[PDB]
Amino acid sequence: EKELYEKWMRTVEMLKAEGIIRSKEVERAFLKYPRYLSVEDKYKKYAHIDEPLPIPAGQTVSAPHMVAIMLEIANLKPGMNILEVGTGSGWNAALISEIVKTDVYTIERIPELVEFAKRNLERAGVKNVHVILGDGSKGFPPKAPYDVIIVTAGAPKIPEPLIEQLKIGGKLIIPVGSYHLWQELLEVRKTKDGIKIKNHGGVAFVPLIGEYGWK
């Protein structure tokens, strides 16, 4: 464990050195919730490596740099109402909760992963995270609107339900592209008259599967 954490601190230092982690909030979250806490034992020895790792049901937990990039873009503030689409391991949701300091909602379509995430969260002592079973491409009406919606799987287009569930001034961070595994990281800000889209560049994510994702 001490070994795993020391390797993790090196990872964090690297991200700060590369200018990936640039804010105090994100550094604090990363140091509080290392990725090894969210992966199966057989993968904990690779948790510090800056690339994605496998998780049950054929999915993956994103690479540290990607999670950092997306969190920095989110510019999370205490009290914000956040929705994550694609819970996976529960790692990103834990990081989010550490920054917003309130209830966090995250949705996952695979039952096995919903339980996987809940277990990781409980074991790590996270309390404010609610893991939901469902199709996140439809968002999560019960707690909308949101300050930020972070999608961790790639879509063929921007899901309309996600734009509708954003507070005016809120933002949707999502990988969108014409390929199942190759997308453009888009930051969509909701305005009083429509939206503003900022393209952050190429990324590679597992496909978002659902009504407003890949079918």
Partner: peptide
């Protein structure tokens, strides 16, 4: 390398 990365 598995898919999420940049």
């Amino acid at each position: 390398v598995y898919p999420x990365h940049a």
